[PDB]
RNA sequence: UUUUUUUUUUUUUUUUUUUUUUUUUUUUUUUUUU
């Protein structure tokens, strides 16, 4: 009973249609737990990133001897929403399929062929949760791997869509996620190529192709001020040290 | 605390607490201020600089105007800004075409109004939406600007920080638009700017004489909200419904899910003030008060309630505490000729008496009653302080003259009939070529495939003679009929149906106003239709001699009429000429005519007869119920005839909507719009058989519907024929009412139809008066793979919720008609004073019911006037049977049931009686 | 072969005695099918890339390749996959590509418009079947009388 | 013109299910063409 998308072309926000949400992060914030970490900040997203190694592995049967082996474990907090979580995420199948899916994006872009015989430790907390989760833990795990020095071809950007009626939406928040479908994307580099594209509720067949275009859009800015933030930080750490 | 991100645009933080059902939550929420707010002026000349396309890539567009309304000294050239309260009970003069020209409403205004009452926010909307070049109303989003928004100060209400805002808004546009002298008026009925509250700037408008009574105007107190939540959830509070009747206003009924009975409530006292069909709040009365301070207590006492309901003559009583919903609209009344006070040219207080007779009488002030004193008004209720004793209204719109045939527009209101015009938005959707609108000579032309991607799936069956008959009034046309002989002896026919779903497109603003109305409306002299002129009278209705789009059925039916081939498809078609019933009965008739076409037309009517034989087969029940059709023209109350033609097309219908149902069914087995008739109780016939059986000594069987259209064909009466019909039409007003459905509510059995023994029904052969049979064309386009189906037609939700809505609004349209029927029956028999005659259907221990059967209006006769010395009546119900003496000349005389007398009619001061 | 069971199953009619159930015996009063609003079938594609890492990251040209269906001796080698859910509305039920391979936008458009007419001929196999199978079943229990 | 051959390391799998939750209601007679 909301006006979602008023005649005049406003979000409930006071956001437009083609609009981000601010766009806060931090580099090196944990430099006494681990080799890389990342603070991102989307809307009113919260997240650490922790990243350890290359490393010894703990034991001798989780070695490669022509590649490394990575890992991924997301931490979902009982704090995280305005209701209290009754139980644990901890051993939820959403969870195992979010960390499956994060670990086979990541495979393809890491040169992982350079660092046999070693391990990558990704460690996630989510600490405040307000819509398109998902995009902001791929922007998280980029930031804090190009922080650790790893090897890698490209960036990798997370982005949200949603379709309300006619109207595309871009970068939903938890109201309109509870109103529409939406669509994930993650976009390599500054081409056209999908890494990720997740769907779960319905959506027309003759409607996609204009939400994939305004996500890849949407998803090449964020690289933009991703890049940006780095390029500013090692200017400061290179300037003086 | 804000920061700048970007282009000019910032960031907050909005927190508050959200109270539900007991517990407590913080809310936390983002807020972004701008800078391209444009002012929608068209006198400015630096807005246009700063907007931006929206989605669809369109530019905003600037409504209000450079040259507004000019007051006098010292203001000048106003606009006017609308506050929270003045929209909320004053939205009568702002819809008044009279005033209010120039309006604008801030966001905090809008968000409240829509807070406290949605309707009142939609009309609100509607008003924003529906601009033009006599009234402008536009929507400043004041919270989202960065030059008008304000941050609440510590230990200060809701309240102030919304005033605050408000004025802030009206300074920013009396800067803003200085330069092109144009002031600002800040209107609200609480306590630089141009402050006035709502009965000042009234006396400043050059026709404040003509507007100025439209202004708006011991019971104990009602419980407070929490407390009334806490009672209800606790289980001491209960909600229902309340009803009362005309004869006795100091007594009520409420029917609660507990209780087996209604709960009575008695006293004028324990009554607050209620009126008819609202939502209340009730609570239980002690034993020692029931019709002959804790919660423990008060279940037990609802406890002893539920145990005394059953066997014990006691009926538990309650009171009202709180009013849920109120009915509340707009009423139609005459003014009382009793309140008024001659001389008297001051303001003064009057009474209104409505046209509802189960609602209160309401105080009106004005100071132009001498005017009224003959004319219907429209009014609406404010408020009933527990003081008064009546509630207080406010005038709103003069209808006309008492009696006089326009006025008379009410019956419209009261029966919640729409009849205004269509908006500019609905018009949009129509096509813009109009009345040139031509299918294509050829349906493979580049052109003519390239603008209809589906063109390659529509047939061409322009190659057959295709008659049409309708009645002499009749413009819009539905349906068409062919006929022609097949080599091998089978008879081929094919109906054609008009497809109005090819220029109608859910999610259109032409959709949304079709399905508001539920049915098209019709009158004797008048019409109000469901769809646009120039679509269904011009664009859609299959005119004869021009192309035409349509949806065309074809079976294969032998000479026994046996269904072995049935096909649907879109096609095109061209019909040749177009007939009505007696011209096709002089068509047929007429000898020396030999084309093939009236062998086509002989034919069908043969082929109907064979069908219509199966039905009766089947089920007999055949009715002939006069409409009491009315034509005078006075520079003559005839009866309806059913003929040859009528029977024709009937069966070609029946057998169309039978097959669609069939065909709906197969292809959507959870939402397929279908039609039902549960078969109904006995108490309405058993009376009936009773007093039949006691005089005229017949019986009607219950066995099933081959045996009651048997029993009803056995009553014969060789004097009188019309009996037969009125026993006819006496067991007309027995059956349940037919109702629409989805095919996912009910099982398979329920779907049958009792008035026509058919297992499954539907309705698809008048799109264009009915949506029931667009929503039918659009599920059987969609069952054919010929194009997917929408969204709301596959969701039960929204198929209930259009159930429901035609469902009341064809039970509307049908009293609609048959009040305005018997209005002008009245009026026709007013004017003219003579004899005529009636049938006793009725017979009362102190009155007789008498029905005129050239009229068709029932008439009762009190005993009081009907017998003098009442006391000497006498009257049995073995024989039904009353005995008095008449007035005119003293002898003992009887009456009985189906007799004959003379009625006449009077005129009405506050019907029909003995002449 | 969930969709096909859900379709064909029917449970034991019921009637309700006051507080308690009753349940009839099969042998006794018909038993009853489920109702389905609609039918959901899956289709899954393979990806191999023809090139190293570098071209199909950095390149102009998009060479990858795309099969259906694949087999036990492809899947062992492929480098991303994708699933589609469609029904005979034209709607998209859900999408899945978890990592993998990158791939042009274009491309998975693509693919998704192949999959629709594989599903509507799925649709009127699995009906048509259903409807013999109801009438070999009528048929014995009409010459069974 | 004799004479001139240099090349590193490793062994046999972490333990306990599918439920993975937010913005507010109503009212008394079949069928077809109108």
Request: charged fraction near 25%; aromatic fraction near 8%; charge should be negative.
């Given at each position: 009973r909301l006006?979602?998308?008023?005649?005049?072309?406003?979000?409930?926000?006071?956001?437009?249609?083609?609009?981000?949400?601010?766009?806060?992060?931090?580099?090196?914030?944990?430099?006494?737990?681990?080799?890389?970490?990342?603070?991102?900040?989307?809307?009113?997203?919260?997240?650490?990133?922790?990243?350890?190694?290359?490393?010894?592995?703990?034991?001798?049967?989780?070695?490669?001897?022509?590649?490394?082996?990575?890992?991924?474990?997301?931490?979902?907090?009982?704090?995280?929403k305005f209701e209290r979580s009754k139980s644990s995420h901890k051993n939820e199948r959403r969870v195992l399929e979010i960390q499956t899916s994060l670990v086979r994006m990541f495979e393809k872009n890491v040169m992982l062929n350079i660092y046999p015989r070693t391990v990558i430790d990704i460690e996630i907390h989510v600490l405040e949760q307000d819509g398109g989760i998902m995009g902001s833990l791929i922007n998280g795990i980029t930031l804090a791997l190009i922080d650790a020095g790893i090897?890698?071809?490209?960036?990798?950007?997370?982005?949200?869509?949603?379709?309300?009626?006619?109207?595309?939406?871009?970068?939903?928040?938890?109201?309109?996620?509870?109103?529409?479908?939406?669509?994930?994307?993650?976009?390599?580099?500054?081409?056209?190529?999908?890494?990720?594209?997740?769907?779960?509720?319905?959506?027309?067949?003759?409607?996609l192709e204009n939400v994939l275009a305004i996500g890849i859009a949407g998803a090449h800015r964020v690289r933009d001020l991703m890049d940006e933030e780095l390029r500013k930080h090692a200017q400061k750490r290179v300037s003086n040290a | 605390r804000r920061k700048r991100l970007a282009d000019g645009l910032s960031v907050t933080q909005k927190v508050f607490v959200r109270s539900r059902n007991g517990g407590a939550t913080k809310i936390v929420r983002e807020h972004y201020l701008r800078s391209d707010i444009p002012c929608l002026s068209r006198s400015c000349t630096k807005c246009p600089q700063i907007v931006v396309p929206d989605a669809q890539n369109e530019l905003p567009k600037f409504i209000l105007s450079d040259s507004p309304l000019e007051l006098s000294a010292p203001i000048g050239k106003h606009y006017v800004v609308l506050d929270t309260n003045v929209v909320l009970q004053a939205i009568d003069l702002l819809e008044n075409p009279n005033c209010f020209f120039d309006v604008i409403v801030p966001q905090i205004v809008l968000d409240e109004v829509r807070n406290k009452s949605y309707p009142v926010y939609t009309r609100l909307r509607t008003l924003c939406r529906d601009s033009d070049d006599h009234k402008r109303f536009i929507v400043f989003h004041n919270e989202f600007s960065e030059h008008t928004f304000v941050e609440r100060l510590?230990?200060?209400?809701?309240?102030?920080?919304?005033?605050?805002?408000?004025?802030?808004?009206?300074?920013?546009?009396?800067?803003?638009?200085?330069?092109?002298?144009?002031?600002?008026?800040?209107?609200?009925?609480?306590?630089?700017?141009?402050?006035?509250?709502?009965?000042?700037?009234?006396?400043?408008?050059?026709?404040?004489?003509?507007?100025?009574?439209?202004?708006?105007?011991?019971?104990?107190?009602?419980?407070?909200?929490?407390?009334?939540?806490?009672?209800?959830?606790?289980?001491?509070?209960?909600?229902?419904?309340?009803?009362?009747?005309?004869?006795?206003?100091?007594?009520?009924?409420?029917?609660?899910?507990?209780?087996?009975?209604?709960?009575?409530?008695?006293?004028?006292?324990?009554?607050?003030?209620?009126?008819?069909?609202?939502?209340?709040?009730?609570?239980?009365?002690?034993?020692?008060?029931?019709?002959?301070?804790?919660?423990?207590?008060?279940?037990?006492?609802?406890?002893?309630?539920?145990?005394?309901?059953?066997?014990?003559?006691?009926?538990?009583?309650?009171?009202?505490?709180?009013?849920?919903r109120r009915s509340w609209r707009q009423y139609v009344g005459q003014l009382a000729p009793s309140s008024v006070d001659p001389q008297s040219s001051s303001t003064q207080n009057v009474f209104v008496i409505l046209m509802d007779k189960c609602l209160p009488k309401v105080r009106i002030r004005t100071r132009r009653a001498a005017e009224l004193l003959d004319k219907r008004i429209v009014i609406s209720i404010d408020s009933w302080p527990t003081t008064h004793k009546?509630?207080?209204?406010?005038?709103?719109?003069?209808?006309?003259?008492?009696?006089?045939?326009?006025?008379?527009?009410?019956?419209?209101?009261?029966?919640?009939?729409?009849?205004?015009?269509?908006?500019?938005?609905?018009?949009?959707?129509?096509?813009?070529?109009?009345?040139?609108?031509?299918?294509?000579?050829?349906?493979?032309?580049?052109?003519?495939?390239?603008?209809?991607?589906?063109?390659?799936?529509?047939?061409?069956?322009?190659?057959?003679?295709?008659?049409?008959?309708?009645?002499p009034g009749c413009v819009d046309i539905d349906d068409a009929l062919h006929a022609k002989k097949?080599?091998?002896?089978?008879?081929?026919?094919?109906?054609?149906?008009?497809?109005?779903?090819?220029?109608?497109?859910?999610?259109?603003?032409?959709?949304?106003?079709?399905?508001?109305?539920?049915?098209?409306?019709?009158?004797?002299?008048?019409?109000?239709?469901?769809?646009?002129?120039?679509?269904?009278?011009?664009?859609?209705?299959?005119?004869?001699?021009?192309?035409?789009?349509?949806?065309?059925?074809?079976?294969?039916?032998?000479?026994?009429?046996?269904?072995?081939?049935?096909?649907?498809?879109?096609?095109?078609?061209?019909?040749?000429?177009?007939?009505?019933?007696?011209?096709?009965?002089?068509?047929?008739?007429?000898?020396?005519?030999?084309?093939?076409?009236?062998?086509?037309?002989?034919?069908?009517?043969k082929l109907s007869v064979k069908l219509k034989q199966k039905r009766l087969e089947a089920g007999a029940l055949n009715l002939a119920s006069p409409e009491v059709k009315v034509h005078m023209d006075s520079?003559?109350?005839?009866?309806?005839?059913?003929?040859?033609?009528?029977?024709?097309?009937?069966?070609?219908?029946?057998?169309?909507?039978?097959?669609?149902?069939?065909?709906?069914?197969?292809?959507?087995?959870?939402?397929?719009?279908?039609?039902?008739?549960?078969?109904?109780?006995?108490?309405?016939?058993?009376?009936?058989?009773?007093?039949?059986?006691?005089?005229?000594?017949?019986?009607?069987?219950?066995?099933?519907?081959?045996?009651?259209?048997?029993?009803?064909?056995?009553?014969?009466?060789?004097?009188?024929?019309?009996?037969?019909?009125?026993?006819?039409?006496?067991?007309?007003?027995?059956?349940?009412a037919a109702q629409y459905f989805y095919s996912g509510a009910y099982s398979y059995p329920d779907f049958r139809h009792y008035g026509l023994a058919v297992d499954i029904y539907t309705h698809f052969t008048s799109p264009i008066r009915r949506y029931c049979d667009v929503v039918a064309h659009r599920q059987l386009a969609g069952a054919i793979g010929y194009e997917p189906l929408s969204l709301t037609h596959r969701d039960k939700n929204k198929m209930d919720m259009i159930c429901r809505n035609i469902n009341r609004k064809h039970r509307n349209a049908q009293f609609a008609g048959?009040?305005?029927?018997?209005?002008?029956?009245?009026?026709?028999?007013?004017?003219?004073?003579?004899?005529?005659?009636?049938?006793?259907?009725?017979?009362?221990?102190?009155?007789?019911?008498?029905?005129?059967?050239?009229?068709?209006?029932?008439?009762?006769?009190?005993?009081?006037?009907?017998?003098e010395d009442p006391n000497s009546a006498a009257f049995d119900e073995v024989e039904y049977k009353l005995t008095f003496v008449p007035t005119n000349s003293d002898k003992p005389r009887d009456v009985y049931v189906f007799d004959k007398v003379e009625v006449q009619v009077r005129s009405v001061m506050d019907e029909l009686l003995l002449k | 072969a969930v969709m096909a069971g859900?379709?064909?199953?029917?449970?034991?009619?019921?009637?309700?005695?006051?507080?308690?159930?009753?349940?009839?015996?099969?042998?006794?009063?018909?038993?009853?099918?489920?109702?389905?609003?609609?039918?959901?079938?899956?289709?899954?594609?393979?990806?191999?890339?023809?090139?190293?890492?570098?071209?199909?990251?950095?390149?102009?040209?998009?060479?990858?390749?795309?099969?259906?269906?694949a087999t036990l001796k492809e899947e062992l080698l492929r480098d991303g996959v994708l699933t589609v859910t469609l029904n005979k509305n034209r709607e998209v039920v859900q999408v899945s590509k978890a990592g993998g391979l990158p791939m042009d936008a274009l491309t998975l458009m693509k693919c998704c418009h192949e999959a629709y007419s594989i599903i509507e001929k799925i649709t009127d196999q699995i009906l048509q079947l259903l409807k013999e199978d109801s009438e070999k079943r009528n048929k014995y229990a009409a010459m069974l009388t």
């Open positions: 006006e979602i998308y008023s005649p005049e072309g406003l979000r409930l926000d006071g956001r437009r249609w083609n609009e981000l949400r601010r766009f806060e992060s931090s580099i090196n914030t944990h430099p006494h737990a681990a080799d890389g970490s990342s603070y991102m900040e989307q809307g009113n997203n919260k997240i650490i990133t922790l990243v350890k190694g290359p490393k010894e592995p703990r034991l001798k049967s989780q070695m490669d001897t022509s590649k490394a082996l990575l890992n991924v474990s997301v931490n979902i907090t009982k704090f995280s090897s890698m071809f490209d960036y990798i950007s997370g982005i949200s869509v949603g379709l309300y009626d006619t109207t595309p939406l871009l970068d939903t928040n938890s109201l309109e996620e509870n109103a529409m479908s939406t669509v994930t994307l993650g976009v390599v580099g500054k081409s056209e190529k999908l890494s990720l594209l997740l769907v779960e509720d319905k959506i027309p067949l003759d409607r | 510590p230990n200060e209400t809701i309240n102030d920080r919304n005033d605050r805002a408000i004025r802030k808004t009206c300074q920013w546009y009396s800067e803003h638009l200085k330069p092109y002298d144009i002031n600002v008026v800040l209107v609200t009925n609480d306590r630089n700017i141009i402050t006035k509250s709502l009965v000042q700037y009234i006396e400043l408008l050059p026709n404040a004489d003509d507007i100025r009574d439209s202004i708006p105007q011991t019971f104990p107190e009602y419980y407070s909200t929490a407390r009334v939540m806490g009672g209800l959830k606790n289980g001491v509070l209960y909600q229902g419904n309340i009803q009362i009747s005309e004869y006795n206003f100091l007594e009520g009924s409420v029917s609660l899910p507990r209780f087996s009975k209604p709960v009575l409530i008695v006293g004028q006292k324990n009554l607050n003030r209620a009126f008819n069909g609202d939502q209340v709040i009730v609570e239980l009365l002690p034993q020692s008060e029931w019709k002959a301070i804790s919660d423990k207590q008060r279940r037990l006492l609802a406890k002893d309630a539920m145990i005394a309901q059953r066997s014990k003559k006691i009926q538990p009583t309650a009171k009202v505490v709180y009013i849920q009546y509630p207080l209204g406010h005038f709103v719109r003069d209808l006309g003259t008492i009696e006089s045939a326009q006025a008379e527009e009410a019956l419209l209101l009261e029966h919640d009939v729409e009849y205004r015009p269509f908006s500019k938005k609905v018009l949009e959707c129509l096509p813009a070529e109009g009345h040139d609108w031509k299918a294509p000579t050829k349906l493979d032309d580049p052109e003519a495939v390239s603008k209809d991607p589906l063109l390659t799936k529509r047939k061409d069956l322009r190659d057959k003679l295709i008659c049409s008959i309708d009645p097949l080599p091998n002896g089978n008879w081929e026919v094919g109906v054609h149906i008009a497809d109005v779903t090819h220029f109608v497109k859910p999610g259109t603003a032409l959709d949304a106003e079709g399905a508001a109305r539920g049915t098209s409306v019709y009158l004797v002299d008048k019409r109000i239709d469901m769809l646009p002129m120039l679509l269904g009278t011009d664009l859609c209705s299959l005119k004869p001699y021009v192309d035409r789009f349509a949806f065309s059925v074809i079976w294969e039916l032998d000479d026994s009429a046996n269904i072995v081939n049935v096909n649907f498809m879109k096609s095109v078609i061209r019909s040749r000429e177009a007939f009505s019933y007696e011209q096709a009965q002089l068509r047929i008739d007429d000898k020396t005519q030999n084309d093939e076409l009236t062998m086509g037309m002989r034919a069908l009517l520079e003559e109350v005839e009866i309806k005839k059913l003929l040859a033609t009528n029977s024709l097309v009937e069966e070609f219908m029946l057998l169309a909507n039978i097959s669609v149902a069939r065909k709906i069914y197969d292809a959507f087995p959870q939402t397929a719009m279908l039609r039902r008739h549960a078969a109904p109780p006995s108490t309405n016939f058993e009376i009936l058989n009773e007093m039949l059986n006691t005089r005229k000594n017949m019986s009607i069987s219950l066995e099933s519907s081959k045996a009651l259209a048997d029993s009803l064909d056995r009553c014969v009466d060789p004097e009188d024929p019309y009996f037969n019909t009125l026993v006819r039409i006496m067991s007309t007003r027995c059956m349940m048959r009040a305005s029927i018997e209005y002008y029956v009245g009026q026709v028999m007013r004017n003219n004073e003579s004899t005529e005659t009636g049938y006793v259907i009725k017979v009362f221990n102190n009155g007789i019911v008498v029905l005129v059967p050239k009229f068709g209006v029932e008439g009762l006769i009190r005993l009081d006037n009907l017998t | 859900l379709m064909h199953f029917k449970k034991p009619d019921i009637t309700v005695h006051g507080e308690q159930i009753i349940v009839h015996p099969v042998n006794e009063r018909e038993p009853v099918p489920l109702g389905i609003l609609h039918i959901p079938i899956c289709v899954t594609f393979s990806f191999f890339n023809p090139q190293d890492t570098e071209e199909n990251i950095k390149g102009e040209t998009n060479s990858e390749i795309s099969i259906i269906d």
